[PDB]
Design a protein around this ligand. Structure first.
Ligand SMILES: CCCCCCCCCCCCC/C=C/[C@@H](O)[C@H](CO[C@@H]1O[C@H](CO)[C@@H](O[C@@H]2O[C@H](CO)[C@H](O)[C@H](O[C@H]3O[C@H](CO)[C@H](O)[C@H](O)[C@H]3O)[C@H]2O)[C@H](O)[C@H]1O)NC(=O)CCCCCCCCCCCCCCCCCCCCCCCCC
Ligand SMILES: *[C@@H]1O[C@H](CO)[C@@H](O[C@@H]2O[C@H](CO)[C@@H](O)[C@H](O)[C@H]2NC(C)=O)[C@H](O)[C@H]1NC(C)=O
Ligand SMILES: *[C@@H]1O[C@H](CO)[C@@H](O)[C@H](O)[C@H]1NC(C)=O
Ligand SMILES: *[C@@H]1O[C@H](CO)[C@@H](O)[C@H](O)[C@H]1NC(C)=O
Lengths: 289, 191, 239, 99
């Protein structure tokens, strides 16, 4: 069911300049925000502290604060050590967290990417390079694996702390996590690249959670030429999706965009192409192109 | 700095035990270690402490570390004259070679010899060889002072150890009037 | 399973002279360091390196440059020696795979002298034990006196029967300035060797006070009238 | 630049001319993370564009959402201009409500 992600983005431009920014996700809801200029980790949900006590949080936060400045310097030194093997600018990404399952089953991960390619993971008790990783990497890895303190801290976060913290998040934020927001659909069209043809767009917006079914229909039959765009986010934590069919001019009548979502009960949204409402909404949309 | 050692100087009688303090603020605090530095020489490793609450020992050296109080203590048992050299406390901020060492300014230990049978006496040289004086065998309380006058040079007190014999003694030397040197003594003195 | 050695032990510099000192190490250590030990301060990093060609600035880099020709060797250079300078320089090497394993060398003593001419070797004289002590204590101390040397770059040792002895010996920790007025004033140092009177009375036992002086190298030529104050041993042999 | 940004411009609600709405600009698939985004009403910068925090996805590619309150009309144009190192010239994408 749920994946917890801590995402770190670290940028090193030269010897002097660097910033680190982090964001935390539970499923597709954002729980935390940690900006380079902020000394503290910012809550983005009221239930972001999960079930941890004020001082439990500080123990977690203080450890991270010390980690941020220590990682920054450790990277700089690693560049100094790799005298021409690698050089600035440097982009590093860390993805760390937990995938929660039923019964307290839980899987942890800490993945590291260098210049956009996945290269290093923490596995068991130590750092590891993954297949296709560049070979110069291993020495840094050896250097880093000689630090059993770091190893013990990471093991605690992955084995125990993360599965514990997210159990608390899933509780304290249950209502937010299980909320249902209804899709709103509207039609439009543009001319196709092919002469004598149109592309019909069905816009679907403001729905939550993510799963959704959006198809063009002629009655019972489903139009196989339906193309589904990517899920695009709204700023109010809802999703947007559009399905585009291609038709011969004059074939639009009879067609309908049909939407299935969990927030609608068993009441699918059937939007008929030439409907009373499509006619009216279209009049409010006219523009000079 | 970020590493404070206390006191600056310590005086102990030979045979006794001495205690040296180290306080620090460095972070993270991966490990703390202790060095011995003899006069005109390098740093010798005594002991290395790694755990949150740790105790280590090396011959007559032992140390404890408190991670929580950011505090460390070095102990020397049955202090010898050889223990004279300055003592440096060092903290390392990483468990990897990417780290940096943070050095304390150190503590000078001064080990006073236990003079069991004092026999204060001044001796005359002579002044070998072919050209032509020692004040010795005094106890710990007696401290020699240098001459105000340019004319006579007086060396500060120092301890020799006759190991084969179970013996030790202090001594000071002067030169430029043997009966009158270095007034600033004890009357018990020879001649 | 080896050593880390700093050359030279002692260094005579002049104001504004370039300064060079070596450090070699056979522990197979990738990391190497240059610290400065100032009185009452503790070590400050000048330069360090992860390997050959690597020289990285530390907190005290200004005024110095360093070069690492190879893994075994790490040089530091003092660009312009200060007018009143007195410094100790400590080299250290470390394992890249074990932070704890760090070894130091025995250090380098720098004394900047304002004029070369000032430099003088010591005169060494040995003194026989005063007879009053023998009857009184049944012990006999020899006294050794090194006098008229600059800078305080000396190593005094005692020698009985062709061998050095560390027992019954005391040497002043601090040398005496012969003219405390003028900076760079020449130095005096005393040492004592105390043996049994029965050991001394025998004239088969040979007693030697040896002083190693570190002065002018053959490297820099000197142009003054009298004997060049070179690195030399001067000893007094008393039976 | 590590890669090239994909840009998608779209409104939060169905567009009704003269009625308040929210316009989104979703920039994806760009490397490195440094990026300059602005939203334009008739070629001029909108006063207060609000930015989501920079994040990334399973395939490591960075994404970010810019959004602003805007009113659709018959003749007012809306655009999202992206400045990135993977592009010599800035890239401007116009909002087109029909596609
Ligand atoms: C140019 C080429 C580039 C290279 C290629 C890529 C690089 C590869 C990847 C590099 C990884 C970077 C690792 C570097 C680490 C260090 O700089 C310092 C070096 O500092 C360490 O601090 C440690 C803890 O303070 C100490 O351990 C300490 O060492 C001590 C001895 O000195 C003890 O051993 C101590 O152990 C004692 O205490 C432990 C409790 O932790 C245990 O209880 C143990 O049992 C006990 O004995 C140990 O902690 C060590 O002494 C010390 O060395 N280590 C740490 O700070 C440890 C923490 C590592 C964090 C791992 C990443 C986490 C993901 C980032 C996400 C950030 C966003 C957070 C937002 C909020 C999220 C909230 C939700 C939280 C959920 C959980 C998240 C999952
Ligand atoms: C945390 O969990 C990991 C793995 O889940 C443990 O690390 C080791 O796992 C490897 C496989 O990668 C095994 O070969 C080892 O036997 C495990 N290590 C040990 C020491 O038994 C790790 O031990 C766990 N750590 C903590 C602190 O719970
Ligand atoms: C280094 O970092 C950034 C490059 O983006 C720049 O703004 C900064 O001025 C640079 N400084 C130097 C000294 O190169
Ligand atoms: C990020 O934060 C660190 C520590 O506060 C700071 O030194 C650094 O300059 C910051 N980088 C920025 C603002 O780009």
């Amino acid at each position: 069911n749920y994946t917890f992600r801590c995402l770190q983005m670290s940028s090193f431009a030269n010897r002097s300049w660097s910033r680190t920014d982090s964001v935390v996700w539970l499923g597709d809801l954002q729980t935390h925000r940690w900006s380079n200029d902020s000394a503290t980790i910012s809550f983005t949900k009221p239930w972001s502290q999960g079930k941890l006590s004020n001082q439990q949080w500080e123990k977690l936060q203080h450890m991270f604060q010390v980690y941020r400045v220590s990682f920054t310097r450790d990277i700089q030194e690693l560049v100094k050590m790799m005298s021409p093997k690698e050089d600035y600018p440097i982009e590093i990404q860390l993805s760390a967290g937990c995938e929660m399952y039923p019964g307290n089953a839980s899987e942890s991960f800490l993945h590291v990417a260098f210049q956009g390619k996945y290269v290093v993971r923490f596995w068991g008790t130590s750092w590891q390079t993954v297949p296709g990783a560049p070979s110069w990497l291993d020495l840094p890895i050896k250097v880093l694996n000689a630090d059993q303190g770091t190893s013990a801290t990471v093991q605690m976060l992955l084995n125990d702390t993360c599965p514990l913290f997210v159990r608390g998040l899933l509780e304290a934020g249950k209502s937010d996590l299980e909320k249902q927001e209804k899709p709103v659909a509207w039609l439009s069209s543009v001319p196709s690249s092919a002469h004598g043809h149109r592309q019909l767009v069905c816009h679907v917006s403001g729905f939550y959670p993510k799963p959704v079914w959006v198809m063009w229909m002629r009655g019972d039959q489903e139009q196989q030429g339906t193309h589904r765009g990517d899920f695009l986010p709204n700023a109010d934590e809802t999703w947007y999706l559009q399905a585009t069919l291609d038709v011969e001019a004059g074939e639009e009548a009879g067609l309908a965009c049909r939407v299935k979502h969990s927030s609608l009960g068993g009441q699918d949204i059937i939007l008929y192409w030439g409907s009373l409402h499509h006619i009216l909404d279209a009049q409010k949309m006219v523009w000079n192109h | 700095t970020q590493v404070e050692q206390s006191p600056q100087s310590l005086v102990v009688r030979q045979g006794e035990n001495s205690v040296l303090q180290c306080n620090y603020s460095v972070t993270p605090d991966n490990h703390l270690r202790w060095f011995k530095q003899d006069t005109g020489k390098g740093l010798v490793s005594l002991t290395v402490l790694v755990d949150q609450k740790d105790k280590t020992s090396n011959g007559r050296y032992s140390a404890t570390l408190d991670k929580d109080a950011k505090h460390s203590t070095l102990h020397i048992t049955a202090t010898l004259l050889d223990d004279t050299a300055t003592y440096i406390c060092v903290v390392g901020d990483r468990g990897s070679a990417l780290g940096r060492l943070h050095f304390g300014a150190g503590t000078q230990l001064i080990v006073i010899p236990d003079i069991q049978n004092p026999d204060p006496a001044v001796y005359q040289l002579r002044d070998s060889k072919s050209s032509d004086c020692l004040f010795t065998d005094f106890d710990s309380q007696t401290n020699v002072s240098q001459s105000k006058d340019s004319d006579v040079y007086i060396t500060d007190k120092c301890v020799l150890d006759m190991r084969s014999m179970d013996f030790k003694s202090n001594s000071a030397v002067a030169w430029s009037a043997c009966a009158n040197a270095f007034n600033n003594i004890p009357e018990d003195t020879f001649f | 399973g080896g050593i880390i050695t700093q050359t030279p032990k002692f260094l005579i510099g002049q104001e504004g002279q370039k300064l060079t000192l070596k450090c070699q190490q056979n522990f197979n250590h990738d990391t190497m360091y240059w610290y400065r030990q100032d009185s009452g301060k503790g070590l400050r990093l000048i330069y360090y390196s992860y390997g050959a060609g690597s020289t990285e600035k530390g907190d005290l880099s200004e005024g110095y440059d360093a070069s690492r020709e190879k893994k075994s060797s790490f040089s530091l250079t003092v660009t312009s020696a200060q007018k009143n300078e007195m410094a100790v320089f400590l080299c250290a090497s470390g394992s890249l795979l074990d932070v704890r394993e760090v070894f130091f060398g025995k250090g380098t003593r720098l004394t900047v002298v304002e004029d070369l001419k000032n430099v003088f070797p010591p005169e060494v004289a040995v003194f026989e034990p005063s007879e009053a002590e023998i009857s009184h204590t049944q012990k006999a101390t020899l006294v050794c006196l090194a006098t008229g040397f600059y800078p305080d770059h000396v190593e005094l040792s005692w020698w009985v029967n062709g061998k050095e002895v560390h027992s019954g010996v005391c040497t002043d920790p601090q040398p005496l300035k012969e003219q405390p007025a003028l900076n760079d004033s020449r130095y005096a140092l005393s040492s004592r060797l105390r043996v049994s009177a029965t050991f001394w009375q025998n004239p088969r036992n040979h007693f030697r006070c040896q002083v190693q002086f570190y002065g002018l190298s053959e490297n820099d030529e000197w142009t003054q009238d009298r004997a060049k104050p070179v690195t030399q041993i001067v000893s007094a042999e008393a039976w | 630049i590590q890669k090239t940004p994909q840009i998608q411009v779209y409104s939060r609600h169905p567009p009704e001319n003269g009625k308040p709405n929210i316009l989104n600009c979703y920039v994806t698939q760009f490397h490195p993370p440094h990026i300059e985004i602005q939203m334009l009403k008739n070629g001029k910068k909108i006063p207060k564009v609000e930015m989501s925090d920079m994040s990334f996805s399973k395939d490591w590619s960075f994404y970010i959402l810019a959004h602003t309150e805007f009113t659709p009309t018959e003749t007012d144009t809306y655009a999202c201009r992206v400045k990135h190192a993977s592009m010599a010239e800035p890239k401007t994408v116009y909002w087109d409500r029909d596609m």
